[PDB]
Amino acid sequence: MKGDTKVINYLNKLLGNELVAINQYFLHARMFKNFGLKRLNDVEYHESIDEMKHADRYIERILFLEGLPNLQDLGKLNIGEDVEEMLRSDLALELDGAKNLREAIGYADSVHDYVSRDMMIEILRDEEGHIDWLETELDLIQKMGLQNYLQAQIREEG
Amino acid sequence: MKGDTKVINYLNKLLGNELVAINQYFLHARMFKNFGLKRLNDVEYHESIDEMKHADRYIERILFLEGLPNLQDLGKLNIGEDVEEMLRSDLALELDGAKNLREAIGYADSVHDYVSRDMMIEILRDEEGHIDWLETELDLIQKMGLQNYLQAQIREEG
Amino acid sequence: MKGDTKVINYLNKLLGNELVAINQYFLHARMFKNFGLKRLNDVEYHESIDEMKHADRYIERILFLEGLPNLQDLGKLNIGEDVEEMLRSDLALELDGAKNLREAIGYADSVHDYVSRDMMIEILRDEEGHIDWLETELDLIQKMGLQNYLQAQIREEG
Amino acid sequence: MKGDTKVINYLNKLLGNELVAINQYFLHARMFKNFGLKRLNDVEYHESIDEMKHADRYIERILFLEGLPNLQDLGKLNIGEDVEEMLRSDLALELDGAKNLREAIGYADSVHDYVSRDMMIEILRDEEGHIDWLETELDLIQKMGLQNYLQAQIREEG
Amino acid sequence: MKGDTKVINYLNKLLGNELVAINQYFLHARMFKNFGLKRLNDVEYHESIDEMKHADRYIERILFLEGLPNLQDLGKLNIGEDVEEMLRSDLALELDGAKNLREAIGYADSVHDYVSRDMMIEILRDEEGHIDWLETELDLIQKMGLQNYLQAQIREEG
Amino acid sequence: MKGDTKVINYLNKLLGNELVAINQYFLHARMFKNFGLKRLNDVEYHESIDEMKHADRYIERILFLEGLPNLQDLGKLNIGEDVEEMLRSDLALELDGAKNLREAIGYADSVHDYVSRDMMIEILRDEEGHIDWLETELDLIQKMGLQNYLQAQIREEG
Amino acid sequence: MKGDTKVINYLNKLLGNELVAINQYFLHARMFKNFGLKRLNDVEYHESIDEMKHADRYIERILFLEGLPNLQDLGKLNIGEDVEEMLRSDLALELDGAKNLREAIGYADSVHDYVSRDMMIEILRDEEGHIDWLETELDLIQKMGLQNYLQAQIREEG
Ligand code: HEM
Ligand code: HEM
Ligand code: HEM
Ligand SMILES: [Fe+3]
Ligand SMILES: [Fe+3]
Ligand SMILES: [Fe+3]
Ligand SMILES: [Fe+3]
Ligand SMILES: [Fe+3]
Ligand SMILES: [Fe+3]
């Protein structure tokens, strides 16, 4: 079914965001794993998978609407060296992505692509989940201090 | 994540509605139970639980959006003395709540708080369910008469 | 069965206490949950449920004794902003409620409402349990320090 | 263990009440059964059993306290001919028994027979249950009318 | 079905016997239990239940035949203070009851109430069982002596 | 929670009783075991455990009420040399303990420590159980004679 | 079998030690429990049980050897107010008991009471276990600091 061109550009832009997040989250995960912060590796890994699911959804939708998924261009990764910096970087990324999502959802509505919208609202809900988790972790770091925070990531959560 | 202030006020207003419904429905439930109308106790009870789930959702959302859930102010309960009056009171309440929900949903959309909107649409769908049930019961009372209606509430539905 | 009027007023006053505790405990629970203090969310939540059970018992008893349960008036919630302040607030509330209970129990005895008394003694025993738990948590905070206390609430207890 | 004499007289008086209720409830049960009111036979039967449990408890307690259980004297049965009259008769009996119980409980307390008291408070709680049930049935008869009430007792409750 | 009047009087007289036996056997049972004669408590208890079954059968039959079951008049209990005396008292009672049964059975036959007769013959067979048991126990007491007999009742029979 | 001082003294006095009973009952148990009176070892042992449960309850309660459990002072053990003397000694002890309990319960009531009272009433009920058992055994010894009584304690009760 | 008198005195002295440890360990356990140090309550409790097993063994042995177990005299409890002080007190007690055990074992050997010796060597092995555990805990307190040590006792070990 031929989709609205501008919806497809939004879908490709959002796909672009997911591609960045996939990599940044996966690297972060294995950095944590190397640091021995087993718990942060598990969560960040499961979030990389999450962004993969999102990418897949965009790709299928773009194809359905007869556009060309763009997996060629990769935006800026911001990696960082310590736990806080890395978490904070994931949060900034997630916030920029939520912004683009809000914009795309409004536009899809106005051209009546309600199923693209519906898909995007689900993804946004997932993003808001990641945002919640990140914000909480970052406050925990301040409230309990870095040393206690680190000790608390050593073992995986059952 | 800092939410839109006016969305938070709506969420607190809706939360306010749920708080009223929770109490009015619970009292009604146990009044029915005391009357020996076992079936009406079961349904109204399960609806009190339902409104609790709604309150919980608002509270979590307000907190997520960094507002202050207001559980302090309690609107007017209207209790009533006989079955019809009590059912009718629940229906009026549910109708005022649906009105506030319609208004909040429109507003959340226009400030792009799509996940608050999504949550609110689910809740509205639940409210419309309660409305359906209440309307039906009230017509049954007219069509079959109060005495038969009452006899029909004595045993619980399997 | 027509109960003693003053017993009913006591039951409504106690019900009043439970209504306050239900809300204060539920809000606290979800505040903790938002803070990421998973363990405190679980305990405070299970205490909100507890106070609900108490409210239900009063409501049923008032109805049985042919009084009018009052779910309309809601006393002062005191919420607070940090863990200690919130725990301490729950403790003060629980202490005022235990005071009213002691008074109601003595009175029910003197008008021979022994089953209302029996119910109230069970509830008091539950309250004393909450008091024990709160006092212990607050001392733990002093003995081990806030930072260690917080780290210790991150994971739920199996 | 030698008990207080007056406690034993109370226990025998209460036992006396149970003996009456046992018979009146059993006869009523089988009258209902004969009437084809299967549901009322089940409940009244289960209440006759209940009063038997009470009698047994008094008998064991009297023996323990070294008194002589009196199963020889039987108070006035009031049987009645139709459903309402019979239910109403059970209610009056249950009310006189609750009165004697309230009095015995106060006295046991003042001579420090706390375990006799504890037993009596449990029994009173059971009586208050029977009272609740009876009152409810009698109101149902008025609210839904005798004909509908009767139809509603034909089948047993699962 | 309207029964023969005199059959109904017999059924009420027999019912009267059962009512006496029910109480005398139950008291004896719990006296034994208090004495620590666990085995005699079990047997006498199971015989009280037995007489209850008999009473129930009479009550249902009287109602069926459209008479008025009489649970108001209670014949003489003879309780006794020691094991032998109490067993012997149960035996005398059981013997008087068998006498009335023999008489009632003959009469029911002559007015053709064969199903009342059939019921009564079953009950008589049960009574003869109790008689057998009682006689045996009483001879055991003589043959082995009271002290050995008592020791032999301490534990329940598997 | 700061308790009433005099309640705490009562709780320590009662705890004192349990401490005595624990030891006297345990020694008696193993004396019986040595005598080969397997059945008396089982019962007395299970009663020593029982008094331990009581001690534990007092200790926890005293601590809760912020007093100092006193396990230092041990009252007079009275051991005795033969079965009767030892049983009789347990009975006297149990009787003195019931006396102190009756007194403590009355006092707890008058200062409104209803949960301490509730706990104490449960314990009293247990004590009254031990008293019943002891009295029965001692009468069995008289009724069946010492030799038969002893033979009857050789095997354990299933 | 008549034992050596001096062995019996040793057994009574060792029994004396166990009696002290039983109480001191049980109180400590419930103090920890009250402090909310769930893990220390579990271990100290399981050590109180352990000392009970030891007492039982001495009591049975003394009886077997035809001496009089002495449960009347209770040595000095040293309770203490904070965790370290209490642990340290248990360690000193355990050390004095090991000393008496070493002495008793040597003596039992020289009078050829090899089975008393064998029993005592097993108990000593258990004591050495408690000593190991206590020493380790006390060093952990120094190495990780009191605050971290406390946090680490909050949850029970699976
Ligand atoms: C104020 C009067 C209220 C009464 C009398 C009441 C009563 C009850 C009762 C009896 C239960 C069942 C206990 C159980 O789950 O085992 C329950 C469950 C629950 N309540 Fe309330 N409640 C009240 C208010 C509230 C409020 C203000 C909230 C806040 C959101 C709330 C949230 C919940 C939740 C989430 C459940 C569990 C539902 C489930 O998973 O089945 N309740 N309530
Ligand atoms: C006097 C008229 C009575 C009638 C017609 C009657 C009838 C019955 C019947 C039909 C049963 C069921 C049989 C079964 O358990 O399988 C029963 C049970 C029982 N009865 Fe009676 N009864 C009478 C009086 C009494 C009295 C005076 C006592 C003395 C306490 C008593 C004590 C009991 C007890 C303890 C049970 C067993 C309850 C259970 O565990 O389910 N009954 N009765
Ligand atoms: C002082 C002489 C005592 C002796 C000889 C003794 C003996 C025993 C024995 C042999 C057991 C069974 C072990 C097991 O549970 O597997 C036991 C259990 C127990 N003891 Fe003691 N004990 C004594 C004092 C105490 C004291 C002072 C307390 C303090 C409250 C206490 C509290 C307990 C408790 C709570 C149990 C577990 C009961 C159960 O759950 O079955 N004991 N005791
Ligand atoms: Fe994504
Ligand atoms: Fe709702
Ligand atoms: Fe409460
Ligand atoms: Fe009763
Ligand atoms: Fe019979
Ligand atoms: Fe005790």
Ligand SMILES: [Fe+3]
């Ligand atoms: Fe030891």
